[PDB]
Amino acid sequence: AVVSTDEYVARTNIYYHAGTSRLLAVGHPYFPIKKPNNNKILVPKVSGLQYRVFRIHLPDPNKFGFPDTSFYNPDTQRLVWACVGVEVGRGQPLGVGISGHPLLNKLDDTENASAYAANAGVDNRECISMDYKQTQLCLIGCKPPIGEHWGKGSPCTQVAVQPGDCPPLELINTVIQDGDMVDTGFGAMDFTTLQANKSEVPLDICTSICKYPDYIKMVSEPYGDSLFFYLRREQMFVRHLFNRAGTVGENVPDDLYIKGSGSTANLASSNYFPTPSGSMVTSDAQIFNKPYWLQRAQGHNNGICWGNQLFVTVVDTTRSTNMSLCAAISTSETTYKNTNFKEYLRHGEEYDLQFIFQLCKITLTADVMTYIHSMNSTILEDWNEDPLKKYTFWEVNLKEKFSADLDQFPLGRKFLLQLGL
Amino acid sequence: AVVSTDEYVARTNIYYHAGTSRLLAVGHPYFPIKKPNNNKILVPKVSGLQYRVFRIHLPDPNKFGFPDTSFYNPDTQRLVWACVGVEVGRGQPLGVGISGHPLLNKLDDTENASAYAANAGVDNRECISMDYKQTQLCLIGCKPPIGEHWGKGSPCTQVAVQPGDCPPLELINTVIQDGDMVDTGFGAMDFTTLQANKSEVPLDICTSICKYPDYIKMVSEPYGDSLFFYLRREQMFVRHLFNRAGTVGENVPDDLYIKGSGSTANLASSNYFPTPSGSMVTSDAQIFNKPYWLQRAQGHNNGICWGNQLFVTVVDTTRSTNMSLCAAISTSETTYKNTNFKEYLRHGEEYDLQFIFQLCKITLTADVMTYIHSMNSTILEDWNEDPLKKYTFWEVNLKEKFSADLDQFPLGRKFLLQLGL
Amino acid sequence: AVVSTDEYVARTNIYYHAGTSRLLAVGHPYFPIKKPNNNKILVPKVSGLQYRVFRIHLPDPNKFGFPDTSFYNPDTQRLVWACVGVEVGRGQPLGVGISGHPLLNKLDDTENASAYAANAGVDNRECISMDYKQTQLCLIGCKPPIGEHWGKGSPCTQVAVQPGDCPPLELINTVIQDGDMVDTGFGAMDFTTLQANKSEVPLDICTSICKYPDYIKMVSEPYGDSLFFYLRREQMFVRHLFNRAGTVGENVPDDLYIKGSGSTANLASSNYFPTPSGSMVTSDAQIFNKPYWLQRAQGHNNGICWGNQLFVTVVDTTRSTNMSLCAAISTSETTYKNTNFKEYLRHGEEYDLQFIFQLCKITLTADVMTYIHSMNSTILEDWNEDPLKKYTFWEVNLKEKFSADLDQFPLGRKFLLQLGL
Amino acid sequence: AVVSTDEYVARTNIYYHAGTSRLLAVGHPYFPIKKPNNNKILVPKVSGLQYRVFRIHLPDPNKFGFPDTSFYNPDTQRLVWACVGVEVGRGQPLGVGISGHPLLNKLDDTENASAYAANAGVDNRECISMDYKQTQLCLIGCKPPIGEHWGKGSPCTQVAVQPGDCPPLELINTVIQDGDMVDTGFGAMDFTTLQANKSEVPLDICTSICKYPDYIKMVSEPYGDSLFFYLRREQMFVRHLFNRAGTVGENVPDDLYIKGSGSTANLASSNYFPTPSGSMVTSDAQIFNKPYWLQRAQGHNNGICWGNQLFVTVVDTTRSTNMSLCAAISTSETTYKNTNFKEYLRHGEEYDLQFIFQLCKITLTADVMTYIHSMNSTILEDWNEDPLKKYTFWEVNLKEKFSADLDQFPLGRKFLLQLGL
């Protein structure tokens, strides 16, 4: 049986504040700029539509040097940091971005038509953009976040997959890495392996995987380390209703309609797809720049940062403004020429993480050691190399950032005022 | 260590009211009107999209002439004014402005297209306007406000910048001056140094810098003098989705799409940009014409106006109505002729600041003098020339506006009723 | 020094109810219908966009005939009516009007253009309508309401105003009269003297003055008689973005853009103007048909109706429905002919004012008489001709409408129930 | 003087529940289907835009057969039913209808025009539909509901009405009958007698009278029998802005504009009219399927059902979905032919009324008999033919529906739970 950490984790009266200075990220909104011949990334892809997964490193409270150490017995017990307060500061002005594709697979406008559309020739793709669905979310836990998305499932050993055959789906659980993309209105799927077309969605998600937090799975998690607190806010509506060019993969059963004739003799593509639109963004609806007091967790792990680690996942599309900056090739002619100017796109993100940590102690009794050993043997081994080297996240080092004077920091003042004593 | 002003600043029982008569500002909404041959400003640029930074001058409480002076010892202590109540009155009717550019860099409409767009020739710019993002904000402190914006960073001494190369970005902290522009939906950046084009955004921000309050930095500030109170309200949504004319600064990696042919042989500009729109404006959402009671500050400076100064920054786009007024060149002909009427544009802004100040005393002990000295030496030096002469703000002199009869003023009545005694 | 009326005005226990039967107003929405050769008004202009200023006449409590007169001494004191409850009843169904101009100065649509617009010829005016900004407001006091609007200021004696020169602006305070127009989305200004064009705005405000309540000034008012209670609710958003035909009054500084060529050689009018739109109207947002209890006024005059007068200003555009009614010239032919039907427009407004008044007494001591004398000498003179004959308002006589049985009226029941005893 | 019923009506402890089984109404949304040669109605007009006035018949408590009759003296007193709880159940899914006219008087689109419209020829009417304004309302009382609407007033005996002259208006109070139409966005008027055109509004109100509850009058009513409880919810916004074809009934005063020339020589119709639109319909905004506890009435009649009658007026346009059903003339050909299918329209309405009644007793003293006699002589006469035979309403008989076991019904359980004892 699993038990609340409140059972075996003792709470001291010591609190420390810790915060990143001010994280900054600048890059191209849709794709990374690199040397054609090369593969080294010159400019990275930085979009408001990517997940930001911060791997927070905390100083080992056992190796740490406290002014007083009488508060615990280093022989019978050990120390762990407990996250009690978080403030995800965001810094750019609110605004909405926009993504498209020069060759988006969009046949005709099916929202309203005055006459039957012509006939699909070869490549009827259009240059089209859209404002993605709005999403604000924040996940906190001592284990990285887990997402779900639809990918291409493995086929059954029978009927040989005829070329062009529809690929099988499979919900795939994955670890959400820093830089991954969020569902933008086309659901959470792997567009690379499910869309040979390469033109069904805008460039920025076009050959990526849009993942959705698997909240269900994470909360079911027995120990609940992956996430002990979260805030989600997503909204979306249909801006336009389109058709997909291409060829019928699956025909419309004729028992569903009466054959036409002349123009209506041939059925138009009924492979419709809508254009998303996350409406207006607003201050009143902000999730960030507000402190989160992680006092009572719904999981058994009540904010204990086992391994002196801490994960903070964030997605904020309420500051997705992309800025176009163009340089002139010549500063002479007083006559505009498109060609005299090179147009570019850049997007900036501004973060500022702040935390309030509470020192905790664990008396290593038999039972406790058995439990903690079962739960996560590494805990004890590390007490008296990176297991997630495969994954990549925004590394954040706070080992030199802890301060006992909450007083001197904004999140600190807030915490004191909130907790009174 | 920094400490709350409540530690060393003593609160008396004397309160004074002070207020501007009624500030008025009239000018052209997009640019200043001046003599061509000259440079003297004939008509200033006045827009609802500019920051209004008021530099409030208060009479030195030490030089002031109070009816009674027994309440303190002018030998052991000194006097400082503490802001306890503010009312930013606004006076025009609610309404929304509008800004454009006769030659805005807008290729084609990418929100929905029935056929692949033509081909960029020379100068495809269009005369286009838009309703900027709505913004309401008020910053109060004893130091001028600080903003952030993206500008052209200094290049790394290596690869010689090829003409037309994309310029490097750099978040630049600046002092927000009266007259500066607010992000309008294109983010906070220096369009002059980041867009040689001179046609990416409407005239009014076209060659300006749109700055955004750096709330994070200001609140991090140790003493918290720059701002001890603020209200922010911003909203925005995507009205239109466009394309940028010009030449590819950075090409779309071909692993992101399948080459076209014929018309779709040549990739259309995927340098999209959206048109902002701050929706409807409403009374229920007003931030002004309401009193603010600065009783408990989140910073250590609890509204103490060191230097007998006080800063009030405001941005209100909920009264951005521009009025067109045209005069006839001739009052004869009874037949309209566009030729016979000169069309103009003017915008008016109406303010009315009101404050409630509480007298305070500081016993100049050793420790206190050491602290205040470290904090801001000028404090003591001034006690028993302008350090921000470089910057410009709406100067407001209140030295002859203090009154002990709160009773006689609207903000004063509100204050008494609110504070009971 | 001014003082609250609670100081010198005594409150009796007598309460009276008074109310208009049901005021009704019918006329043409845009302009008055009169005899061409004549000037007598045949049908008046009645629009939901006009101010309704009611001049309420009360019976002199001193001349009044009460059943009992022991409650006061007619030698040492005098009587005044105090307004304690008001109910502005409105009666038509909720709905939105619409106003336009057959020759509105609207060059091209600047919200989105696919090619550079043609060239302004002679008279490019269009027949255009719009739905004005929604406004609901109610002002109550014992003095008429005061508004503000921009008008043509007086010129400085220097540079002879060249014909067509932009006229100078000046905020002008005025008395708000019954029938005046409310800002409709083009701000509060005098379109007659500021727009020679006569085609900048719809007919109904085209040659009128749109005034806005000068809430700041009225509340600053020392005695606060002009308004001791108010409710305001206004909202508006940009429906369309247009261009103004006519000739450049002020040219666009060339440092703001790069000269064009060919079609873009000539700059298009950058004299943009938006089309307003007061969104949806709703019950939940109604201000009227609700009682207002004027118990504690923010001004010094706590609802005392000096002069036995009372002003109730209202503006309600949530019932601005205009109804078109056409009569057939012939009732024969069974074939429609536009020539056979004369189309017209009419708008109806329905009001019903109800009040609860509390009798008050003033012992005429020396000090009291000095005060009241300074405040408004007429008070005393009238105690033991019309000073606003110049202005016009909906005259309402209630001298025969007072009743001591609040019980018998809806506002009266409400009042009793509210005030318990 | 009038007095609350609480004065002379005694409340017993007996409560009964009563309810309609499930009322159902099906018909054509715009007009009744009848035999051409005949006049008998084959299919009635059933629309979500009609008023539903239910005439509820209750069993005479005096003739009723109670198990116990000791609770009162049949010699000195009489019995009356008092309505204490109502639940207007609605049953179809939420949805919005739509109404139009094949020949609607709509000249041109005046919301935005690129060139001056052509010229009105003969009959420029268009086939146009719209979504009416949303309205939810419920009126309850013991007298039928009263409405107001504008109709053709009687002319003054002077200037002989020239044919085509604009007809005079007059607010007309009427009894609201079951089947009457609700203002749909064109206000409350008699379109038959005020629009010879017969094409100004959609078919469904085209030759009807749209009435609006005269809330003001009904509440002013001395005894307050017509309505002792009500709920109203209405919203509407302008979807389109149009022009009216026809001929100028009243010309535009030339002092309001500058004569045009060429195309603008002739003024276009400035008889604008907007197209309504009651926005989205929502559950959260439902008024029905909720119980109403009529405990304290604002009128003097506190829910007493004199005459053992009860009126429940309802208007619900949140379930106005019309369903088109077409039958094939031939089930052969496998090729669509518009001529092979007959298209129709039908609309269904589903109600379910539920009430909780409280038995009351009245000791017939002198005074009481004088009062009741004055109030409504029929009361006494009926105690120990139909006066509204001329009007119509959905007759509802509940004489056999009363049950003492509230327990056994949903409204009953709710009532008990709400009233505790």
From TrEMBL, chains A, B, C, D:
Subunit structure: Self-assembles into homopentamers. The capsid has an icosahedral symmetry and consists of 72 capsomers, with each capsomer being a pentamer of L1. Interacts with the minor capsid protein L2; this interaction is necessary for viral genome encapsidation. Interacts with protein E2; this interaction enhances E2-dependent replication and transcription activation.
Keyword Disulfide bond listed: yes
Subcellular location: Virion; Host nucleus
Protein name: Major capsid protein L1
The protein's role, per its UniProt record: Forms an icosahedral capsid with a T=7 symmetry and a 50 nm diameter. The capsid is composed of 72 pentamers linked to each other by disulfide bonds and associated with L2 proteins. Binds to heparan sulfate proteoglycans on cell surface of basal layer keratinocytes to provide initial virion attachment. This binding mediates a conformational change in the virus capsid that facilitates efficient infection. The virion enters the host cell via endocytosis. During virus trafficking, L1 protein dissociates from the viral DNA and the genomic DNA is released to the host nucleus.
This protein's encoding gene: L1
Pfam families: Late_protein_L1
Family the entry assigns: Belongs to the papillomaviridae L1 protein family.
Keyword Disulfide bond among record annotations: yes
Family matches, as InterPro entries: Capsid_L1_Papillomavir, Capsid_L1_sf_Papillomavir, dsDNA_vir_gr_I_capsid
One CC-aspect GO term: T=7 icosahedral viral capsid
A GO MF label: structural molecule activity
GO biological process: endocytosis involved in viral entry into host cell; virion attachment to host cell
Keywords: Capsid protein, Disulfide bond, Host nucleus, Host-virus interaction, Late protein, T=7 icosahedral capsid protein, Viral attachment to host cell, Viral penetration into host cytoplasm, Virion, Virus endocytosis by host, Virus entry into host cell
Chief localisation class: virion
